Amino acid sequence: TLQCTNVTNNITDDMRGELKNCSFNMTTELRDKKQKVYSLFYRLDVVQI
Amino acid sequence: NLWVTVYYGVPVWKDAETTLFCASDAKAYDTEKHNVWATHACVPTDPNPQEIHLENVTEEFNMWKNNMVEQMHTDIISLWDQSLKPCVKLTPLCVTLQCTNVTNNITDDMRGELKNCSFNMTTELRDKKQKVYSLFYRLDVVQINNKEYRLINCNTSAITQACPKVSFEPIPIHYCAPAGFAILKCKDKKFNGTGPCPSVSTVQCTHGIKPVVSTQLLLNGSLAEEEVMIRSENITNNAKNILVQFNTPVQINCTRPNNNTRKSIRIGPGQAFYATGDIIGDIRQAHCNVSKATWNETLGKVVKQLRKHFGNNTIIRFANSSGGDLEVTTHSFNCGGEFFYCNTSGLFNSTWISNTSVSNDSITLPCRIKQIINMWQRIGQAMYAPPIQGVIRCVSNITGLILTRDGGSTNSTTETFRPGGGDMRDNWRSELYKYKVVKIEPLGVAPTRCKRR
Amino acid sequence: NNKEYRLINCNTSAITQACPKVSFEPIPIHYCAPAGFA
Amino acid sequence: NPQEIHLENVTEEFNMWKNNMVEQMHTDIISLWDQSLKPCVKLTPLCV
Amino acid sequence: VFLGFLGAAGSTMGAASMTLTVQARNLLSGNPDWLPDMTVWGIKQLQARVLAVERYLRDQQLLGIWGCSGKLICCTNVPWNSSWSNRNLSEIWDNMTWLQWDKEISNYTQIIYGLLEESQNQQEKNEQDLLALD
Amino acid sequence: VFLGFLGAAGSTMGAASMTLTVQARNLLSGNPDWLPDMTVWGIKQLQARVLAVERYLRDQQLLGIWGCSGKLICCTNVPWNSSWSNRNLSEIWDNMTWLQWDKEISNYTQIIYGLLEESQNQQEKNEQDLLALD
Amino acid sequence: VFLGFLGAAGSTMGAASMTLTVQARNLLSGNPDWLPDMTVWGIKQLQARVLAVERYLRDQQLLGIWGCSGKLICCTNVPWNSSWSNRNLSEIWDNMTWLQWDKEISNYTQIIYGLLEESQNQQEKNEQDLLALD
Numbered sequence: 001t002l003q004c005t006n007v008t009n010n011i012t013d014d015m016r017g018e019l020k021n022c023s024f025n026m027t028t029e030l031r032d033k034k035q036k037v038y039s040l041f042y043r044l045d046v047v048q049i
Numbered sequence: 050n051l052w053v054t055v056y057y058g059v060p061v062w063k064d065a066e067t068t069l070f071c072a073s074d075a076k077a078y079d080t081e082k083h084n085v086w087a088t089h090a091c092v093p094t095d096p097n098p099q100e101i102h103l104e105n106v107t108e109e110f111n112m113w114k115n116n117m118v119e120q121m122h123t124d125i126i127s128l129w130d131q132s133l134k135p136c137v138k139l140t141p142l143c144v145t146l147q148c149t150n151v152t153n154n155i156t157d158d159m160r161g162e163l164k165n166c167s168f169n170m171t172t173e174l175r176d177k178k179q180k181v182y183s184l185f186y187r188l189d190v191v192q193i194n195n196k197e198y199r200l201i202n203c204n205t206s207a208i209t210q211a212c213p214k215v216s217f218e219p220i221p222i223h224y225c226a227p228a229g230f231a232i233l234k235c236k237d238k239k240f241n242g243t244g245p246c247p248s249v250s251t252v253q254c255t256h257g258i259k260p261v262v263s264t265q266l267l268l269n270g271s272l273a274e275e276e277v278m279i280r281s282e283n284i285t286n287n288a289k290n291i292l293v294q295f296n297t298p299v300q301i302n303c304t305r306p307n308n309n310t311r312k313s314i315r316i317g318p319g320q321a322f323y324a325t326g327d328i329i330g331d332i333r334q335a336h337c338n339v340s341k342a343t344w345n346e347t348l349g350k351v352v353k354q355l356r357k358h359f360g361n362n363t364i365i366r367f368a369n370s371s372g373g374d375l376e377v378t379t380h381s382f383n384c385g386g387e388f389f390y391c392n393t394s395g396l397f398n399s400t401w402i403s404n405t406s407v408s409n410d411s412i413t414l415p416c417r418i419k420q421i422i423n424m425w426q427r428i429g430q431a432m433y434a435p436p437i438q439g440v441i442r443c444v445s446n447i448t449g450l451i452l453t454r455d456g457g458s459t460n461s462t463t464e465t466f467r468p469g470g471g472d473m474r475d476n477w478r479s480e481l482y483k484y485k486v487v488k489i490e491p492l493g494v495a496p497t498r499c500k501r502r
Numbered sequence: 503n504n505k506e507y508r509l510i511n512c513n514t515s516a517i518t519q520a521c522p523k524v525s526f527e528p529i530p531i532h533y534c535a536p537a538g539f540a
Numbered sequence: 541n542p543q544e545i546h547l548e549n550v551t552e553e554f555n556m557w558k559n560n561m562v563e564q565m566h567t568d569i570i571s572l573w574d575q576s577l578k579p580c581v582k583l584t585p586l587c588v
Numbered sequence: 589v590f591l592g593f594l595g596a597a598g599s600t601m602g603a604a605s606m607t608l609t610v611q612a613r614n615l616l617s618g619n620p621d622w623l624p625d626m627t628v629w630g631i632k633q634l635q636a637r638v639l640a641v642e643r644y645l646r647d648q649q650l651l652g653i654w655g656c657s658g659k660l661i662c663c664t665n666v667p668w669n670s671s672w673s674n675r676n677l678s679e680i681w682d683n684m685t686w687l688q689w690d691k692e693i694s695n696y697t698q699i700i701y702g703l704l705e706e707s708q709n710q711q712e713k714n715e716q717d718l719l720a721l722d
Numbered sequence: 723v724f725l726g727f728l729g730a731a732g733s734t735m736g737a738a739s740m741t742l743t744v745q746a747r748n749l750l751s752g753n754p755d756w757l758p759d760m761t762v763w764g765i766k767q768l769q770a771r772v773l774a775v776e777r778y779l780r781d782q783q784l785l786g787i788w789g790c791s792g793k794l795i796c797c798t799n800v801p802w803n804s805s806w807s808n809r810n811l812s813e814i815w816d817n818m819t820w821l822q823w824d825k826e827i828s829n830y831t832q833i834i835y836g837l838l839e840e841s842q843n844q845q846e847k848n849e850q851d852l853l854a855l856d
Numbered sequence: 857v858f859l860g861f862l863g864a865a866g867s868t869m870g871a872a873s874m875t876l877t878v879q880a881r882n883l884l885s886g887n888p889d890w891l892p893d894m895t896v897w898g899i900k901q902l903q904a905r906v907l908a909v910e911r912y913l914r915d916q917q918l919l920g921i922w923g924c925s926g927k928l929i930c931c932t933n934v935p936w937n938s939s940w941s942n943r944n945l946s947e948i949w950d951n952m953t954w955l956q957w958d959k960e961i962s963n964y965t966q967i968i969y970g971l972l973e974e975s976q977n978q979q980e981k982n983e984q985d986l987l988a989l990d
């Protein structure tokens with residue numbers, strides 16, 4: 001699950017801006033812990049449920 | 050008066066490089082170890098090795114431009130991957146391990162480094178998880194900062210466990226020439242490696258070669274003939290290694306004294322991980338013994354063969370390794386399943402007068418053990434060695450060395466031959482130096498007097 | 503030891519599902535001799 | 541057309557129990573099972 | 589004298605001509621049995637023994653387009669050139685090896701194959717068709 | 723005239739008969755080197771160049787069971803049939819191509835192979851065995 | 857009489873000699889088409905049909921080093937030995953099969969191949985070279 005955000009520059013929303021500053025809990029090097037990363041981006045994505 | 054006449058089947062060969070075979074050695078069915086090194090696919094040996102000497106033949110050999118070494122190098126690597134492919138993977142072992150020094154550090158001036166690690170491993174089912182213990186051994190992280198630990202194998206590559214049913218005992222494997230080609234075998238006792246061999250024979254299958262992975266010391270290799278050989282791609286150039294072959298075999302005895310035990314903890318629906326159990330009995334470091342008298346004689350015999358290139362009545366030295374990779378700085382090899390990483394610093398402290406050098410029944414060598422190896426040139430995989438239940442002792446012949454010369458302006462002073470290695474191909478050139486692959490071109494034309502129709 | 507259960511298939515080997523598109527109806531298969539043999 | 545040719549005056553000694561055709565079909569069926577189940581769906585997370 | 593396979597590699601070309609069928613019988617069939625089914629290591633050796641018969645039939649094709657076709661000693665109708673090996677008889681067949689012979693001809697050998705595939709059977713066959721109706 | 727490989731595909735059968743050894747030398751050995759070990763893409767091309775020599779030796783087998791065996795022009799002892807190609811000489815060899823010839827014979831070609839494998843060497847060989855003891 | 861493939865396996869060797877080209881035409885080309893690309897099951901059958909031509913060319917090589925080279929009936933110059941099959945003529949060719957013949961020769965057959973590869977073309981060819989200059 002990726003909690004995302006529109007890019008910080010939608011300047012003049014008549015023109016389009018669609019890159020999603022997504023952050024998510026990805027697995028890591030080890031199996032014990034997990035780290036949160038970010039920045040998958042781009043228009044192809046779900047809208048969520 | 051005379052016309053051209055073709056002759057089909059003339060002894061004419063041109064040197065080329067093609068794919069070779071491999072031999073089963075014929076005892077493979079009675080081994081029944083399910084899979085040895087190349088028992089998987091190799092074909093049995095012929096009842097009589099067709100070794101035919103070719104009189105009046107001088108053939109120019111060059112062991113350093115040979116393509117047979119490249120084939121055996123690419124055969125061993127493809128042998129490793131196909132052997133570890135269907136075995137058990139251990140990627141869930143990359144967890145956090147709260148470890149502890151072994152309970153017996155007795156006299157901390159002497160060293161004791163086995164980590165009684167416990168960790169939350171996954172289990173048969175996916176719902177629950179169980180906590181196990183006892184991974185052990187020196188190779189490990191220090192953690193990020195009972196102290197926590199993790200695997201630095203996980204810091205590089207994925208991990209897969211070696212199949213416990215297969216073995217690492219080298220079966221004698223001699224390469225064989227296919228149809229239409231031939232293998233030329235040098236036969237004079239003294240051979241430079243580079244130059245014309247005045248006594249050449251031909252075979253299809255070569256002589257039995259044991260695939261031995263070893264550094265600093267060649268093990269279970271073929272002995273030289275009457276004299277110690279000092280071969281090199283370029284003796285003047287320092288960076289090129291110096292392959293040595295022994296006349297007399299140097300006896301070596303290695304022991305893993307820890308009467309060890311194993312644990313088969315169940316992971317996943319079909320897999321099963323083998324863990325190093327608690328050490329039963331006393332503990333001490335693994336070691337390798339070399340008789341001091343034989344090694345003193347072997348050095349006193351190699352030094353004279355080295356003076357032929359570097360000066361009569363001059364002094365040469367050799368200290369221990371310089372530094373760098375653990376597989377390069379240490380005499381690394383395998384025996385019984387465990388991978389010994391011994392340090393040969395106790396063997397190379399010598400300076401040589403023109404007649405002598407500058408009791409002690411034997412020379413012992415400290416040796417550490419490692420179970421996770423990143424020796425694979427594909428840095429995407431690493432192998433976990435399963436523990437061997439019991440005490441390990443293995444004897445071997447030492448037949449070769451791999452040395453590097455200290456560069457610089459050391460002409461008027463002495464030269465130094467530190468040990469080295471790294472490239473696996475140097476382990477094969479001491480066995481494939483006398484062999485060259487040639488292709489047969491039996492179509493010849495010659496003028497005789499005759500007429501058709 | 504609603505009662506708990508698990509798979510004893512998991513007590514032996516890994517599990518994989520058969521492809522639903524393939525079938526197990528036996529097609530008549532008769533072996534054939536290659537060239538040079540009979 | 542299956543080339544079925546009877547060989548007159550021929551008596552051939554057969555032995556179905558030392559036959560190697562059975563070993564081939566046995567090794568063909570097993571290799572047929574594994575290659576059929578290889579690309580299919582694994583259910584290892586079902587071990588719960 | 590036999591001396592086995594390739595035994596006359598350093599002998600005279602006349603003495604080595606006495607061992608033609610020995611070098612031939614051992615080049616084609618070095619038969620390895622591949623009944624065991626091992627996946628990836630067969631394709632390298634099977635490719636080797638398929639290129640073996642590809643190289644073999646290339647020689648048979650050259651030994652077929654020429655008037656020579658018996659897998660033995662054979663004579664042609666192309667004359668020897670004095671520019672090729674300026675030597676008399678018995679200087680070759682009693683003081684030369686097949687290797688040293690192929691070495692001296694290697695400068696001039698490439699055209700001899702053309703002189704044997706065109707100067708003969710492009711014309712010898714054509715003459716055979718134009719001289720057999722009577 | 724040569725004109726290289728397949729250069730006389732539209733010429734007369736007599737002019738194309740002057741380029742037999744050119745079409746033969748380039749069909750058997752189109753040698754690709756497969757020293758690199760690439761897993762799955764070799765088995766398709768290696769199967770192709772193995773079926774190449776399987777198709778080649780099938781022609782050599784047909785060119786062996788017949789009295790013809792030299793890989794050249796060759797004559798037999800089976801007479802030509804007036805039902806096959808109702809044409810005189812020099813109407814064929816100077817106004818016909820090998821393609822158009824094989825097209826007109828394609829109706830009657832299947833029995834000619836049988837007339838060359840039975841009417842001869844089932845009887846010619848038998849006569850050779852029954853006429854050489856004297 | 858034909859009786860198809862292997863039809864004369866129990867007939868006389870003289871009657872079976874009348875069906876040589878039938879057993880030959882069906883051993884080399886049992887052509888299976890392998891246009892479909894199926895990974896691991898091709899290497900077993902392709903190895904089979906490659907060893908087929910390896911075994912085939914081994915016989916052609918033995919049928920080439922001998923004075924016999926036509927893929928037909930052929931005569932040699934090696935005399936028959938009374939120790940091999942102490943029988944007169946027509947006792948063989950009219951009351952014996954090729955199987956029972958190969959069975960009685962199996963004791964003495966291994967040296968006959970040597971008597972055909974050395975006693976002839978190691979000497980017959982050498983005599984041909986030393987008898988054609990005149």
Ligand SMILES: *[C@@H]1O[C@H](CO)[C@@H](O[C@@H]2O[C@H](CO)[C@@H](O[C@@H]3O[C@H](CO[C@H]4O[C@H](CO)[C@@H](O)[C@H](O[C@H]5O[C@H](CO)[C@@H](O)[C@H](O)[C@@H]5O)[C@@H]4O)[C@@H](O)[C@H](O[C@H]4O[C@H](CO)[C@@H](O)[C@H](O)[C@@H]4O)[C@@H]3O)[C@H](O)[C@H]2NC(C)=O)[C@H](O)[C@H]1NC(C)=O
Pocket residue numbers: 394395396398
């Ligand atoms: C690398 O190369 C190095 C150097 O080449 C090698 O290291 C050397 O190893 C040797 C052997 O172990 C070390 O020798 C020392 O020997 C003394 C014992 O001999 C001394 O004392 C004797 C009585 O106790 C005495 O008899 C001796 O001779 C005297 O008396 C006679 C009487 O006639 C007289 O004739 C002589 O003139 C002398 O007066 C002699 O004095 C031993 O005590 C040493 O060990 C102790 O002390 C050292 C340091 O003090 C300490 O480190 C040890 O732990 C121990 O406490 C030692 O064994 C020699 O010292 C080593 N050299 C160095 C620099 O350490 C080495 O083996 C090569 N390989 C490796 C792996 O390094």
Ligand SMILES: *[C@@H]1O[C@H](CO)[C@@H](O[C@@H]2O[C@H](CO)[C@@H](O[C@@H]3O[C@H](CO[C@H]4O[C@H](CO)[C@@H](O)[C@H](O)[C@@H]4O)[C@@H](O)[C@H](O[C@H]4O[C@H](CO)[C@@H](O)[C@H](O)[C@@H]4O)[C@@H]3O)[C@H](O)[C@H]2NC(C)=O)[C@H](O)[C@H]1NC(C)=O
Pocket residue numbers: 216218261268269382383384385386442443444445446
């Ligand atoms: C260089 O060459 C030397 C040869 O001198 C090799 O040394 C041998 O290495 C092998 C493999 O490690 C050793 O064989 C092992 O011996 C163990 C002890 O067996 C004892 O009892 C048996 C039965 O009577 C005796 O034959 C044997 O001598 C011992 O007294 C076994 O437990 C080992 O079992 C292995 O094989 C069995 C086969 O069924 C398997 O079931 C096991 O799982 C396991 O795989 C094994 O047999 C041998 O003892 C060594 N010494 C010799 C022969 O002198 C070096 O390994 C080699 N390489 C290097 C790099 O040095």
Ligand SMILES: *[C@@H]1O[C@H](CO)[C@@H](O[C@@H]2O[C@H](CO)[C@@H](O[C@@H]3O[C@H](CO)[C@@H](O)[C@H](O[C@H]4O[C@H](CO)[C@@H](O)[C@H](O)[C@@H]4O)[C@@H]3O)[C@H](O)[C@H]2NC(C)=O)[C@H](O)[C@H]1NC(C)=O
Pocket residue numbers: 007008021023037038
């Ligand atoms: C997309 O979203 C991501 C978040 O998922 C975002 O990355 C974050 O950017 C902010 C920018 O302010 C980072 O916040 C600061 O980063 C600096 C380093 O440049 C730190 O030094 C800061 O910490 C200091 O100040 C803090 C204030 O209280 C102190 O508490 C602290 O002790 C330090 O003095 C502060 O963290 C933030 O760290 C990142 N996130 C990560 C994980 O790095 C990204 O910028 C977004 N991109 C766009 C284009 O919108």
Ligand SMILES: *[C@@H]1O[C@H](CO)[C@@H](O[C@@H]2O[C@H](CO)[C@@H](O[C@@H]3O[C@H](CO)[C@@H](O)[C@H](O[C@H]4O[C@H](CO)[C@@H](O)[C@H](O)[C@@H]4O)[C@@H]3O)[C@H](O)[C@H]2NC(C)=O)[C@H](O)[C@H]1NC(C)=O
Pocket residue numbers: 151152165167181182327328
């Ligand atoms: C490396 O560390 C591991 C731990 O990860 C360690 O294994 C543990 O060893 C101790 C040794 O005392 C075990 O503790 C006992 O084990 C015995 C079985 O031998 C049990 O019977 C004991 O339980 C009895 O006594 C308890 C005391 O209160 C009672 O509560 C209980 O009801 C029983 O009467 C006790 O558990 C311990 O079990 C193991 N750990 C595991 C998981 O088995 C190992 O020894 C260390 N190795 C080295 C060399 O340091």
Ligand SMILES: *[C@@H]1O[C@H](CO)[C@@H](O[C@@H]2O[C@H](CO)[C@@H](O[C@@H]3O[C@H](CO)[C@@H](O)[C@H](O[C@H]4O[C@H](CO)[C@@H](O)[C@H](O)[C@@H]4O)[C@@H]3O)[C@H](O)[C@H]2NC(C)=O)[C@H](O)[C@H]1NC(C)=O
Pocket residue numbers: 369370371372378394
């Ligand atoms: C070749 O031989 C030379 C000697 O001729 C050898 O050099 C020595 O290597 C050892 C290590 O193998 C060095 O010993 C270390 O020295 C450092 C300080 O220099 C210490 O900090 C080390 O102790 C640490 O680790 C211990 C482990 O438990 C801890 O207990 C301790 O608290 C420290 O953390 C250790 O003593 C030694 O200094 C050098 N130098 C000499 C001349 O002895 C060299 O390693 C050999 N091999 C190679 C590849 O050259």
Ligand SMILES: *[C@@H]1O[C@H](CO)[C@@H](O[C@@H]2O[C@H](CO)[C@@H](O[C@@H]3O[C@H](CO)[C@@H](O)[C@H](O)[C@@H]3O)[C@H](O)[C@H]2NC(C)=O)[C@H](O)[C@H]1NC(C)=O
Pocket residue numbers: 001002003023024025036
């Ligand atoms: C990534 O992982 C973090 C932490 O593992 C996730 O944070 C979790 O967010 C949920 C939703 O808010 C928290 O649930 C809430 O918990 C409180 C009590 O702590 C409860 O009262 C609420 O009703 C609600 O259930 C959860 O606690 C929190 N985890 C922790 C450890 O704080 C995060 O959602 C994950 N995903 C992303 C995209 O960041």
Ligand SMILES: *[C@@H]1O[C@H](CO)[C@@H](O[C@@H]2O[C@H](CO)[C@@H](O[C@@H]3O[C@H](CO)[C@@H](O)[C@H](O)[C@@H]3O)[C@H](O)[C@H]2NC(C)=O)[C@H](O)[C@H]1NC(C)=O
Pocket residue numbers: 145146147167168169180
């Ligand atoms: C293996 O698994 C066990 C249990 O799943 C792990 O035990 C866990 O240890 C952590 C660290 O102490 C505990 O976190 C602590 O929780 C308390 C409240 O319970 C909180 O107040 C502390 O601040 C701290 O966060 C955790 O609770 C504990 N889990 C349980 C179920 O007790 C253990 O660490 C794992 N690893 C190893 C190597 O054993």
Ligand SMILES: *[C@@H]1O[C@H](CO)[C@@H](O[C@@H]2O[C@H](CO)[C@@H](O[C@@H]3O[C@H](CO)[C@@H](O)[C@H](O)[C@@H]3O)[C@H](O)[C@H]2NC(C)=O)[C@H](O)[C@H]1NC(C)=O
Pocket residue numbers: 190201204205372
């Ligand atoms: C992840 O793996 C890398 C290696 O792939 C680790 O790099 C390690 O870095 C240390 C730094 O000290 C190396 O130590 C070396 O010691 C010799 C003397 O013994 C010194 O001369 C060198 O200059 C160097 O300092 C070490 O060899 C090197 N490799 C390993 C396997 O440890 C890295 O540390 C690993 N990551 C973590 C977090 O540990």
Ligand SMILES: *[C@@H]1O[C@H](CO)[C@@H](O[C@@H]2O[C@H](CO)[C@@H](O[C@@H]3O[C@H](CO)[C@@H](O)[C@H](O)[C@@H]3O)[C@H](O)[C@H]2NC(C)=O)[C@H](O)[C@H]1NC(C)=O
Pocket residue numbers: 341342345404405406408409
């Ligand atoms: C390895 O071989 C060398 C060369 O043979 C051995 O060197 C010899 O070592 C012994 C005792 O260490 C020397 O004897 C002693 O020499 C000193 C010199 O000052 C003298 O003062 C003593 O009274 C005693 O004679 C010997 O001279 C020396 N050289 C020779 C040629 O023997 C070395 O010991 C050998 N290492 C072994 C056997 O472990």
Ligand SMILES: *[C@@H]1O[C@H](CO)[C@@H](O[C@@H]2O[C@H](CO)[C@@H](O)[C@H](O)[C@H]2NC(C)=O)[C@H](O)[C@H]1NC(C)=O
Pocket residue numbers: 006008009010011013
């Ligand atoms: C990003 O896009 C959002 C709309 O998705 C813009 O948000 C609105 O901007 C208008 C300006 O006319 C405000 O009146 C609305 O109140 C804004 N909506 C919300 C929910 O606050 C936004 O301006 C765009 N750009 C930036 C820099 O965020």
Ligand SMILES: *[C@@H]1O[C@H](CO)[C@@H](O[C@@H]2O[C@H](CO)[C@@H](O)[C@H](O)[C@H]2NC(C)=O)[C@H](O)[C@H]1NC(C)=O
Pocket residue numbers: 150152153154155157
């Ligand atoms: C295990 O190693 C540790 C050090 O890592 C040893 O612990 C020290 O031992 C000395 C004895 O001279 C004590 O004075 C120190 O107080 C100990 N350190 C700590 C932190 O307690 C220990 O002796 C070794 N052996 C055993 C049996 O634990």
Ligand SMILES: *[C@@H]1O[C@H](CO)[C@@H](O[C@@H]2O[C@H](CO)[C@@H](O)[C@H](O)[C@H]2NC(C)=O)[C@H](O)[C@H]1NC(C)=O
Pocket residue numbers: 300301302338339340411444
């Ligand atoms: C390595 O081990 C072997 C066998 O254990 C040793 O050979 C023995 O050596 C002793 C002492 O000389 C003899 O009494 C025995 O008769 C030998 N046995 C055999 C089977 O030869 C060898 O000496 C050891 N070498 C080293 C360097 O430790």
Ligand SMILES: *[C@@H]1O[C@H](CO)[C@@H](O)[C@H](O)[C@H]1NC(C)=O
Pocket residue numbers: 150154157161162196
């Ligand atoms: C105990 O383990 C620690 C881990 O940090 C190590 O540094 C220390 O040397 C060990 N002590 C021993 C083995 O005496």
Ligand SMILES: *[C@@H]1O[C@H](CO)[C@@H](O)[C@H](O)[C@H]1NC(C)=O
Pocket residue numbers: 282283284285286
């Ligand atoms: C060896 O290296 C030296 C220094 O580069 C060079 O002068 C010499 O020619 C080299 N010899 C050979 C055989 O490569």
Ligand SMILES: *[C@@H]1O[C@H](CO)[C@@H](O)[C@H](O)[C@H]1NC(C)=O
Pocket residue numbers: 353356360361362363403
């Ligand atoms: C140098 O050569 C001489 C004579 O060839 C030889 O006796 C001597 O051993 C050589 N040098 C040394 C010190 O070995």
Ligand SMILES: *[C@@H]1O[C@H](CO)[C@@H](O)[C@H](O)[C@H]1NC(C)=O
Pocket residue numbers: 402403404
């Ligand atoms: C070696 O011994 C010989 C013979 O005793 C002697 O002539 C020579 O000078 C000695 N050399 C050295 C370096 O001691």
